[PDB]
mmCIF file of C-alpha atoms in Angstrom:
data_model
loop_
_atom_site.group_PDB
_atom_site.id
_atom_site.type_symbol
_atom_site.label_atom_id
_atom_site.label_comp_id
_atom_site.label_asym_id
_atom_site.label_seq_id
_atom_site.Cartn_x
_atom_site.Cartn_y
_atom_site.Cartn_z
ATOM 1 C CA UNK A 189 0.000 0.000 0.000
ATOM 2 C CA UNK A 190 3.058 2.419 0.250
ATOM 3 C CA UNK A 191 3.687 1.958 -3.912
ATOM 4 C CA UNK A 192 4.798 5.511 -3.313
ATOM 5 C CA UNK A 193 8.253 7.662 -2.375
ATOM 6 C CA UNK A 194 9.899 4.430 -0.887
ATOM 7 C CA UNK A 195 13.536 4.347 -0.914
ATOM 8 C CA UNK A 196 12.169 2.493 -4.052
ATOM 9 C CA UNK A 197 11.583 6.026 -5.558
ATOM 10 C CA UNK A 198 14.328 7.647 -4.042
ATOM 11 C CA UNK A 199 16.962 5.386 -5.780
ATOM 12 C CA UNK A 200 15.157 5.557 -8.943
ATOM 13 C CA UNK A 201 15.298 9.189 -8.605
ATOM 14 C CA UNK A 202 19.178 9.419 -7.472
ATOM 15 C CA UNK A 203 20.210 6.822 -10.033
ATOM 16 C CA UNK A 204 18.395 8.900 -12.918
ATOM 17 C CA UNK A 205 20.157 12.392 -11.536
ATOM 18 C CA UNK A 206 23.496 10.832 -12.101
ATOM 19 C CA UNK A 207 22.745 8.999 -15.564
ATOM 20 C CA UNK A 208 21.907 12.404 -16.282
ATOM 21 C CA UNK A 209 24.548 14.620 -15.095
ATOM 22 C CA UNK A 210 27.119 11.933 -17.173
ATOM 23 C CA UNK A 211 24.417 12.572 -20.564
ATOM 24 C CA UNK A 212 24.663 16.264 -20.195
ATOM 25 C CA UNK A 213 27.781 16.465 -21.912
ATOM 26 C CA UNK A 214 26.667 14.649 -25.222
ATOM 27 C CA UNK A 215 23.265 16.261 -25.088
ATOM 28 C CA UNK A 216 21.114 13.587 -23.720
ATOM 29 C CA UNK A 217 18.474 13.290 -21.019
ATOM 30 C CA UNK A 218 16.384 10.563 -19.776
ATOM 31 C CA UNK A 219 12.963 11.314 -18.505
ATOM 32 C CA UNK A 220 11.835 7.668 -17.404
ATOM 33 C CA UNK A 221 14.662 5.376 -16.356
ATOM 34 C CA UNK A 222 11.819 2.774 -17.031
ATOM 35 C CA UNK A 223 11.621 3.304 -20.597
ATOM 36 C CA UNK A 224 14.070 5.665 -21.882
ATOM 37 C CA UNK A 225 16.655 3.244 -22.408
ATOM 38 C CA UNK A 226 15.250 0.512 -23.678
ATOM 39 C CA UNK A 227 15.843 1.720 -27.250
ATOM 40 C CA UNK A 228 19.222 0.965 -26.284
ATOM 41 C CA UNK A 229 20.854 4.710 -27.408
ATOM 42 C CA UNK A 230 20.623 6.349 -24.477
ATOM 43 C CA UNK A 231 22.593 3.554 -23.042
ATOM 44 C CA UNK A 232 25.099 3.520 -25.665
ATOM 45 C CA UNK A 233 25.401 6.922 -25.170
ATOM 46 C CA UNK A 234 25.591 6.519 -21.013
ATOM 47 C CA UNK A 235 28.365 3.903 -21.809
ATOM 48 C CA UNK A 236 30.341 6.004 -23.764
ATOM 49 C CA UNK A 237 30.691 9.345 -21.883
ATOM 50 C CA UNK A 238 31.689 6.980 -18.471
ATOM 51 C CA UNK A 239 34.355 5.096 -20.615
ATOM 52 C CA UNK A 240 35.543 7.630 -23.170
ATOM 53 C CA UNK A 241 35.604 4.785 -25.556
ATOM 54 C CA UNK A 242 33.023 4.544 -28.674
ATOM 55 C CA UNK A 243 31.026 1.514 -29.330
ATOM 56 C CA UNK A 244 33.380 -1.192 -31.715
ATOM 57 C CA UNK A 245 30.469 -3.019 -32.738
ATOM 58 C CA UNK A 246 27.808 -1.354 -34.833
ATOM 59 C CA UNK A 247 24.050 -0.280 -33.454
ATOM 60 C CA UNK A 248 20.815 0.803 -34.848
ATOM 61 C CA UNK A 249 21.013 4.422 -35.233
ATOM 62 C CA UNK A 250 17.160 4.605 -35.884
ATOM 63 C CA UNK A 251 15.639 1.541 -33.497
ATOM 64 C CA UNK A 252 12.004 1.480 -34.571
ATOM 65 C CA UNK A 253 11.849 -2.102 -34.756
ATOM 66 C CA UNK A 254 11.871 -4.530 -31.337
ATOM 67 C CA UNK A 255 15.171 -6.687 -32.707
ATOM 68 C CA UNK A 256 16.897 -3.551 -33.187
ATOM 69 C CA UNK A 257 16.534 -2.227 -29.239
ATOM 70 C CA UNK A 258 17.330 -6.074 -28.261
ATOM 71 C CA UNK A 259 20.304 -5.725 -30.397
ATOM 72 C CA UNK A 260 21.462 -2.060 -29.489
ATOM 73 C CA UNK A 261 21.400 -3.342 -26.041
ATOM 74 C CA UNK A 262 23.106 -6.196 -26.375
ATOM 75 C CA UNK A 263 26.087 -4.541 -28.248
ATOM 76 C CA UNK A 264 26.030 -2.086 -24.827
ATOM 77 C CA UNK A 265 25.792 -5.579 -22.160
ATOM 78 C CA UNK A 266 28.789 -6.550 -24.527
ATOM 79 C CA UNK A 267 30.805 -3.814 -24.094
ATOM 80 C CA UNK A 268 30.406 -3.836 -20.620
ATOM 81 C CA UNK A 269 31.614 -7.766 -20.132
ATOM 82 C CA UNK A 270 34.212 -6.790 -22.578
ATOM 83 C CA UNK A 271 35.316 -3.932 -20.417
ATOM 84 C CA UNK A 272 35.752 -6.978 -17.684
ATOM 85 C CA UNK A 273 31.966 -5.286 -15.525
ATOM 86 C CA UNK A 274 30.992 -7.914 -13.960
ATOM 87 C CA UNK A 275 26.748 -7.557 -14.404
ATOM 88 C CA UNK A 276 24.185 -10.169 -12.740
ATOM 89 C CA UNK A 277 20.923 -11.481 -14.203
ATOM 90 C CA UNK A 278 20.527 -9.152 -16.736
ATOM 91 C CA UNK A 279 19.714 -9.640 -21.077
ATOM 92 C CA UNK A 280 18.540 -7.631 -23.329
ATOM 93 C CA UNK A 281 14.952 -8.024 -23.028
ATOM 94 C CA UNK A 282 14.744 -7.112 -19.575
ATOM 95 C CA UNK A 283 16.094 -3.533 -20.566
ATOM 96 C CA UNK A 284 14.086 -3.597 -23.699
ATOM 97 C CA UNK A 285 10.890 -4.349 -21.701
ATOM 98 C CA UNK A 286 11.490 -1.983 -18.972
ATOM 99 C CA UNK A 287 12.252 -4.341 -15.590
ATOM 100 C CA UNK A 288 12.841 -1.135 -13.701
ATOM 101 C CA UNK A 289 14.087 -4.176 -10.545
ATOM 102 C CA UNK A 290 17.545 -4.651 -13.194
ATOM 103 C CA UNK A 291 17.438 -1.810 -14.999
ATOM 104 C CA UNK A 292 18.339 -0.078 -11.175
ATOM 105 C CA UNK A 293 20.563 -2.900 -10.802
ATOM 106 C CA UNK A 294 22.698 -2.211 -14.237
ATOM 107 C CA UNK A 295 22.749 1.576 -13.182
ATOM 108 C CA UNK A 296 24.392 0.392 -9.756
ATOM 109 C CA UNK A 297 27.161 -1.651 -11.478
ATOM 110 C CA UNK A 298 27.796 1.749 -13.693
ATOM 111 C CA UNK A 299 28.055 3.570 -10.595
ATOM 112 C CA UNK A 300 29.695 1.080 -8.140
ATOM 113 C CA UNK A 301 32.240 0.613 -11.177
ATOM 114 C CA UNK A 302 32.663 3.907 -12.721
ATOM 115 C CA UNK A 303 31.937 6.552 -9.566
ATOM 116 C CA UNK A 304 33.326 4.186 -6.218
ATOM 117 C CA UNK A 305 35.570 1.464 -7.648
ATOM 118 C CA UNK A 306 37.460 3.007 -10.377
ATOM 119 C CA UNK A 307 39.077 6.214 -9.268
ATOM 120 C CA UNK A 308 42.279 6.521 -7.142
ATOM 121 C CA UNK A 309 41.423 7.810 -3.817
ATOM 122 C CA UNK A 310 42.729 9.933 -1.315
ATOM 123 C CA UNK A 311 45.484 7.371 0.064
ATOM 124 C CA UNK A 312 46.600 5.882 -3.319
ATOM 125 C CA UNK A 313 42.640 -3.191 -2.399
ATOM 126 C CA UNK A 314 41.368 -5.964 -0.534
ATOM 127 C CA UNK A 315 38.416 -4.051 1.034
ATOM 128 C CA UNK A 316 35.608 -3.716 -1.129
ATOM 129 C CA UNK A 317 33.986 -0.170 -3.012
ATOM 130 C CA UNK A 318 32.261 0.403 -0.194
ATOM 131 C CA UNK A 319 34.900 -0.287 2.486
ATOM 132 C CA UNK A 320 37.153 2.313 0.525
ATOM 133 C CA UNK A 321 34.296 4.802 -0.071
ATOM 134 C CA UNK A 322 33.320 4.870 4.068
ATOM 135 C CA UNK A 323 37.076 5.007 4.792
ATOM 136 C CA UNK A 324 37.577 7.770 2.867
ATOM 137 C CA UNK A 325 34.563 9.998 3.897
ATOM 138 C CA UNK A 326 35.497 8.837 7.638
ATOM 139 C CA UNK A 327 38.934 10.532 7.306
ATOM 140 C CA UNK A 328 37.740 13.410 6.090
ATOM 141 C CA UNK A 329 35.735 13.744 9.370
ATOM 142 C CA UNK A 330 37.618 11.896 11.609
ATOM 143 C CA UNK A 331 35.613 13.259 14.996
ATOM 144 C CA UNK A 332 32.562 11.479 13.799
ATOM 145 C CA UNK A 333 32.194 7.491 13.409
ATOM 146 C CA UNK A 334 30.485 7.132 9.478
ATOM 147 C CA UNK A 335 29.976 3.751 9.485
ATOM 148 C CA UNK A 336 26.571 3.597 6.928
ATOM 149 C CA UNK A 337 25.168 5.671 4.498
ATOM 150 C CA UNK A 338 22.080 5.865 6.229
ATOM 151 C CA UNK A 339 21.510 6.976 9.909
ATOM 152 C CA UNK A 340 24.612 8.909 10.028
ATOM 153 C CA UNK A 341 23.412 11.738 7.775
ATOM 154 C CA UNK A 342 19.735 11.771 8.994
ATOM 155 C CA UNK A 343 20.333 14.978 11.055
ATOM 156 C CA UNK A 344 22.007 16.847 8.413
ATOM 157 C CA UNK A 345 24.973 18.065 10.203
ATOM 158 C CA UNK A 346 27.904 15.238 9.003
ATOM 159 C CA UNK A 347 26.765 16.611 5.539
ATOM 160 C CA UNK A 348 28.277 20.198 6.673
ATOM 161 C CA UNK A 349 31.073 18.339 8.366
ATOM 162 C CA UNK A 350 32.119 16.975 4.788
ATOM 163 C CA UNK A 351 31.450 20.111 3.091
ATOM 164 C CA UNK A 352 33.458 22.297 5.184
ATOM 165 C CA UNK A 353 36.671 19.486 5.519
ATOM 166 C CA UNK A 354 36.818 19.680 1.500
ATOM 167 C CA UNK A 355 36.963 23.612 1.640
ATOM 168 C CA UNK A 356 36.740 24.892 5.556
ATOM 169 C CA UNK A 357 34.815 28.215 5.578
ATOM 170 C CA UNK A 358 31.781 26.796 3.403
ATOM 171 C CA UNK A 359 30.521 25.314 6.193
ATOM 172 C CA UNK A 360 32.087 26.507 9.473
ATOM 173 C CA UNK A 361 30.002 26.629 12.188
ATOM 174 C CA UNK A 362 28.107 23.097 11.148
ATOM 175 C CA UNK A 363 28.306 21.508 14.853
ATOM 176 C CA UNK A 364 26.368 24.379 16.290
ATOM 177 C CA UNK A 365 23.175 23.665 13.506
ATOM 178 C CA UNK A 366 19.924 22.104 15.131
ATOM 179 C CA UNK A 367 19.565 18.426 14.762
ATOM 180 C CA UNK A 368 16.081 19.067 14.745
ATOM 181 C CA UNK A 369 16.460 21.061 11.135
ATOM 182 C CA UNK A 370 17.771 18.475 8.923
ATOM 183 C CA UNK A 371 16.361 19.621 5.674
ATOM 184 C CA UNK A 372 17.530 23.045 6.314
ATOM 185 C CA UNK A 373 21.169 21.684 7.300
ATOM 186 C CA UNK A 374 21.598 19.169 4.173
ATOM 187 C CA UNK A 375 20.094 21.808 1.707
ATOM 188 C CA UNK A 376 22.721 24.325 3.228
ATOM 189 C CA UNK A 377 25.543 21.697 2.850
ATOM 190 C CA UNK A 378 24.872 20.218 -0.391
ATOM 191 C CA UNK A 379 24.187 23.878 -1.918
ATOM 192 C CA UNK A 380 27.555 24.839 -0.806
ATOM 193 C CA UNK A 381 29.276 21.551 -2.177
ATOM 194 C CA UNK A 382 27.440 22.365 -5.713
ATOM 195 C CA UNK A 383 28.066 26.032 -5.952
ATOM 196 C CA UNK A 384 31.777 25.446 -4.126
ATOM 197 C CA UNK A 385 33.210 21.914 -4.480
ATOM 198 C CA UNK A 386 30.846 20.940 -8.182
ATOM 199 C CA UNK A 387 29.487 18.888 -6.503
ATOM 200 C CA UNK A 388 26.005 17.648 -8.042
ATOM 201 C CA UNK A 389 23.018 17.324 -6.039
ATOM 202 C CA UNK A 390 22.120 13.895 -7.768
ATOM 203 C CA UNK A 391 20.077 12.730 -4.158
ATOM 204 C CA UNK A 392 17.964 15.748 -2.969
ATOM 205 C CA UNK A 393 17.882 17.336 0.825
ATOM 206 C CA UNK A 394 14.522 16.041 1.273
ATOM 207 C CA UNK A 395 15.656 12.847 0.153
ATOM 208 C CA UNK A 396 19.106 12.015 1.452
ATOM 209 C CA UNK A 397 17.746 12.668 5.115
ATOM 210 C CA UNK A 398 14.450 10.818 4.826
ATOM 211 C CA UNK A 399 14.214 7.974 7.287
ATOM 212 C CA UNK A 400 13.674 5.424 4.425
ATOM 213 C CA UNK A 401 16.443 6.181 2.436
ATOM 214 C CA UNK A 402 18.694 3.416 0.827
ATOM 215 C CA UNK A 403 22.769 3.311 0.987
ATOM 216 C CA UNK A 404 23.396 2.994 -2.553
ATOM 217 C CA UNK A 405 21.478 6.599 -3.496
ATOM 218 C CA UNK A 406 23.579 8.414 -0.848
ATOM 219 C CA UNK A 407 27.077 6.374 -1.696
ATOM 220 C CA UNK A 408 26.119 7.397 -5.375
ATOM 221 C CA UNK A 409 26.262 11.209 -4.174
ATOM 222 C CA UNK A 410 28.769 10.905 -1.845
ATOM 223 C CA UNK A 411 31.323 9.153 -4.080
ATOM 224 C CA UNK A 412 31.271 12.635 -5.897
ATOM 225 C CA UNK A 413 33.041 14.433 -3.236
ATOM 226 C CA UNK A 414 36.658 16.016 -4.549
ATOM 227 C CA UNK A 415 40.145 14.885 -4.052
#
């Protein structure tokens, strides 16, 4: 009865935001994770821009026709195994259909892979993505214990702890906000880390300290955080 705003939505949202802010640069948008790539371009297109390769294999450039979005999207699940991304129970069909349950899941590999597991981190790897993405938040703001990307930032005020450790001044007097004002702290935070640090606000402040939110939408924004 709650087919409404669960973390569900909230991690359809956030993955969307970041598909997005990667399609920006080659003019691209999706509207509807559900259905906008199961033409299999917008995918291409996603696949490209993350691995500043092109597609080796040729696509339909005009996919009108059902075989040619199974195909287009094959050529992309190709690429990917090629590119040694590991993906889980995922063909062609379920993208072309629009099984928003993998079609999340393939956008978390992308992001897990491309955003936490691939870049070089602060301190130059037998702990997992997410291992290396709480240690490296946590020493950042070593006077608080982040151990989830959940609970932690409910109140709003580790968000202005992060903030002001990238640049201090953009967030300086963060221990002294109310608890009790967590909307008001994150949206103060995360405004400063896009204006400041360019950092994008691909999870919202209504959404990033709402009690139901999942780890995955807030490790997707928080891998975004400089140096």
């Amino acid at each position: 009865l709650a087919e409404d705003a669960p973390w569900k939505k909230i991690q359809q949202n956030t993955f969307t935001r970041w598909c997005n802010e990667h399609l920006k640069c080659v003019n691209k948008r999706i509207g509807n994770l559900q259905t906008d790539l199961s033409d299999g371009l917008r995918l291409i297109a996603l696949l490209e821009v993350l691995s500043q390769k092109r597609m080796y294999r040729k696509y339909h450039q005009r996919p009108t026709f059902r075989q040619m979005q199974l195909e287009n999207v094959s050529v992309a699940l190709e690429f990917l195994d090629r590119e040694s991304i590991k993906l889980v129970s995922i063909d062609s069909k379920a993208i072309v259909d629009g099984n928003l349950k993998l079609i999340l899941g393939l956008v978390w590999t992308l992001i897990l892979h491309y955003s936490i597991s691939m870049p070089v981190w602060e301190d130059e790897k037998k702990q997992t993505p997410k291992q290396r993405l709480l240690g490296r938040i946590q020493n950042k703001i070593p006077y608080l214990p982040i151990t989830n990307f959940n609970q932690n930032w409910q109140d709003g005020k580790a968000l202005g702890a992060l903030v002001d450790s990238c640049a201090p001044g953009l967030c300086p007097d963060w221990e002294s906000w109310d608890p009790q004002k967590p909307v008001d702290n994150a949206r103060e935070a995360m405004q400063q880390a896009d204006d400041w640090l360019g950092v994008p606000q691909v999870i919202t402040p209504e959404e990033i300290i709402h009690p139901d939110v999942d780890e995955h939408s807030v490790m997707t924004y928080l891998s975004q955080f400089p140096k």
